Amino acid sequence: GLDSPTGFDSSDITANSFTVHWVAPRAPITGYIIRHHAEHSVGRPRQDRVPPSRNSITLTNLNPGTEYVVSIIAVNGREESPPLIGQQATVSDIPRDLEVIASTPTSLLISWEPPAVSVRYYRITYGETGGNSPVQEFTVPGSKSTATINNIKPGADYTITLYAVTGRGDSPASSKPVSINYKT
């Protein structure tokens, strides 16, 4: 009865949120239904319906680092249409390549791949062997994919672990901590 929505795609993605896009049919509609659900689950899929004046939909509350199948259903009020379903993936929250690029006698330069997500800050822990205490946790001002590691002590094996913290609304979050090694 109407046209099929295609030429769709996905983008504006994130770790706990991501948007999708899709052109409209050659006829007037009343609203499009957007349902999304990871193909790695059998529970009930979430249903997000969008208006007729929206070709994209920002999805949120979604596990970061996972493929989510989104089924787009068209509807002209009491009629129906072909479901423009697609498949995308939520960005990952944990970084990678945690290595040092500058070993100063009192600090080190850490660098990790930049995750396609809005990280608010990272809390890394210092890895000291026999210094005078356990790992030292220090917050990171999301300065960039590389952070600094001063307050270090020379003369003793070392280690480093980062806990990128990502906000989630009334409560932030922190993927698994990636730890590496370092000799002082």
Q: What is the CATH number of domain 92-184?
A: 2.60.40.10
- The 8-class DSSP code of residue 117 comes to S
Residues with Cβ within 8 Å of residue 104, at least 6 apart in sequence: 150, 152
Residues with Cβ within 8 Å of residue 141, at least 6 apart in sequence: 121
- What determination technique applies here? NMR
User: How far is Cα 66 from Cα 49, in angstroms, rounded to an integer?
Assistant: 22
Range 53-59, long-range pairs (CB < 8 A, 24+ positions): 55/21, 55/22, 55/23, 55/24, 56/12, 56/19, 56/20, 56/21, 56/22, 57/19, 57/20, 58/12, 58/17, 58/18, 58/19, 59/17, 59/18, 59/19, 59/20, 59/34
List every span in the chain annotated with CATH 2.60.40.10: 1-91, 92-184
Q: Would you state the CATH architecture of domain 1-91?
A: Sandwich (2.60)
